[model samples]
Target chain A: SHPDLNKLLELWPHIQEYQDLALKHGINDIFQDNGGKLLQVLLITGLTVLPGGNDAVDNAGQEYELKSINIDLTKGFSTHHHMNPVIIAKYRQVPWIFAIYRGIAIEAIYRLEPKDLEFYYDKWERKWYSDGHKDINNPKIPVKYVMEHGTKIY
Target chain B: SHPDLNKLLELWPHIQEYQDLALKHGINDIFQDNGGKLLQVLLITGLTVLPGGNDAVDNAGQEYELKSINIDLTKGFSTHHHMNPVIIAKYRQVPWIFAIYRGIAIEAIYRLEPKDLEFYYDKWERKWYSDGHKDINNPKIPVKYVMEHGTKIY
Candidate 1:
């Protein structure tokens, strides 16, 4: 079982402390599947961790879908992960906080609202894999679009 | 930012439906960094999504770090993801639910408690890659130990 929310929040500070320590220890991606969670605690204040649905709600009851990707800034923002159309269709209305983390720190956070998601949906699509199997080509965030259109909220 | 826990729970059904649907369309690994979230809604009953800390709490207030890994059932469970010693040391006290998913469906769920984490800590360690970079050799779940020790929950 996991710890309570209060306890989890209490442990937040230590997570950062250890992450910095771990980075120096030559450990990368220490928090697997938790980049978004870390972004939540760091960026959102008065955030309520709900029982279901989106990531969390802000003090003013604003919804967000937090996503963070590690990248080499020099190489530009080309992420290897793909998005599920099912998920995009479901959360099309929610705003997403897309942050780029150079190493352990966030380089920039882009706030993409519902309109942004809709506008850039088609552009995110990439060429399908040419393998002989039934491989489906999923949507990836187009570097130029997100960089040009997304609001740098950070 | 994420959907509210309640709203997220409501969307849980569709995630499954869509995942199954997407699978047919050859869209695999649709929900990146969210396999754990999907597992939480499916496995835990009367779960509460907290603002921070462990993933979520069950009806009886049992905490869990829900993790789902996609694997080919035909082959043995050898995952490419590595474990951070710093994280392992911190969350050593928390129980983790490690589920193996074949394609889109979960094949087995392993319940690894604090004791289990400790028991197999060193065993999960692989040889330090001899590459001449400052690459740190992290821990991975030893296929043999998990299959042997982890209590199959589902």
Candidate 2:
């Protein structure tokens, strides 16, 4: 069963530490306020239910690493490019929940660095921007807001 | 290191039994006159190079039940609805060579299903047809002809 939002809010202090890390790295605004952290936790929870449960690795003997791959402005941003701000916010509200979800998800589906993100940020940035209508003009708004609000907590 | 194609051709006769099985199970049109036999041998060679090679699966373990999937075009048709004729013709000329190439490529990329053929077929078909110009009627012809008559195999 899913954890209650009140339980998440009770754990807000711990989640803020993670959010602060994103802000320090440049992913600050989008998740600082509202339900940003909640979103992150929920996404990670969903990931745990997949085939390999987030810990699946290739037979190539490489260690499993779950780096954020892409951020749809359709979903709020994380402080880090790959880290989703909403997820961080969610983690801020519910620390163990995301960690447990990550533990299970990683064990199930092997993760890879998203090739699409590499292609888009490097070669096809313009094409992706045109199709997604990414807000480049105010790109820093979400990051800045999250950082300021997040720092005030601690 | 990759195996020599000529050496693989030498062992073609020995592998024909598996090819016949593939044909019986619906993987037909693989060999020219004796093309069916050659494809099965190539598949064995391909499987031999995988993690457990031919011995990867234990008899009692769930992993052992994961036998290599085979498809024969002569009995029915490869799943690519549009390019069946071209693929059938190509297999006739060079049975094991293309089979080995495709087999190794899929195994290397960690894809084990015959359905992966359909995935690539759909992807290319969309790209080709998306421009509103269906100039290329034969899909398999483009790929096969390019590999066969073109400059050099990469």
Candidate 3:
């Protein structure tokens, strides 16, 4: 179970101060203490730490239904390095589908290789890949199908 | 009396092309041969240059009126340097404004007094001032106004 709601409110000021300091130093590493640690553990276990669990009703009578918050964080980690060239070409046929696939690929890449580890850093650095091959040319293939089928080892 | 309206329309494309070229080069200079130049002169002298002269009326019976299109062609030639200490203060606050102003003033003095034109070419020169006077506490007074009114007059 979660701690008293009043206790969480008391830590708001400290959280704000920490956020200010982090912004100033460009330090995005967040560390949770006793209360935060408990929250994280609950989150990992798919358990609700708030009062009345996931179905807790608010003052407006809106029930807090627990939903899947864990994103497929490894979607596009190494798209340029690993995604099949043929599959990418096939997906670039339909405008809407191509756009969706491109978005998913972008998100996957972001999760796999965050800002601290991207290839281009300095302004002078140049990519060796052909500009034509870098962007999608067709748009027929759906992104959801691509991710599901692409992830299979077979 | 107005000249031929058809003649003005015939020459519009060439005039438009010239105007486009001027805009492309970031030049505010606009000129017209004969008709346009005469129209501008007449307008500047408080005269209407419409088809029927001063009290011209369109096909819809709406009267054409004189309007001022103030163009500052020689604005870029001004020697007056502008400072934005007040705007900086409104967004952040006093301390930041002071620091920025003093830093700018110190660098201006260093470069102007020494006549060091090479400082303009140096990418990593520490000779640039990065501090400002903090003793001046008037929030209402802007940096440009203060510099114009209070700076040494020799």
Q: Which tens-of-lDDT digit does each residue in A1-154 have in candidate 1?
A: 4433343334334434444533333333333444333533343332454445676567788888766666654434322344444454656768876667553445567777888767554434322223332223443565456677778865
Q: How does residue B66 of candidate 2 score in lDDT? A: 21
Judging by lDDT, tell me the better candidate of 1 and 2. Answer: 1
lDDT of 2 by residue, A1-154 (tens): 0122233234333334443433433333322222222223223333221133233233453322232211222222322343233323332331111111121011111211333123223333453346574333312213232333332211
Give the number of the best model, judged by lDDT: 1
The Cα error of candidate 1 at residue B40, in Å, is 30
Model 2, A95: alpha-carbon shift in Å? 5.6
Please report the candidate that would top DockQ against the real structure: 1
Q: List residue ranges in candidate 2 displaced over 4 A.
A: A1-88, A91-154, B1-81, B96-154
> What is the per-residue lDDT of model 1 for residues B1-154, given as tens digits with 9 covering 90 to 100?
3333333334334434444533433333323444323433343333454544676577788887765556653333432344445544556667776767554345677777888766555444332223332224433465566678888876
lDDT, ranked from best to worst: 1, 2, 3
Each prediction's RMSD over C-alphas, in Å, is 18.3, 23.3, 26.4
lDDT-best of 2 and 3: 2
**Ten-residue region with minimum lDDT total, candidate 3 chain B:** B102-111
B-chain TM-scores per prediction: 0.54, 0.23, 0.20
Question: 1 or 3, which is superior by TM-score?
Answer: 1
Sort all candidates by TM-score, best to worst.
1, 2, 3
Stretch of 10 with least lDDT, candidate 1 chain B: B126-135
TM-score, candidate number 1: 0.34
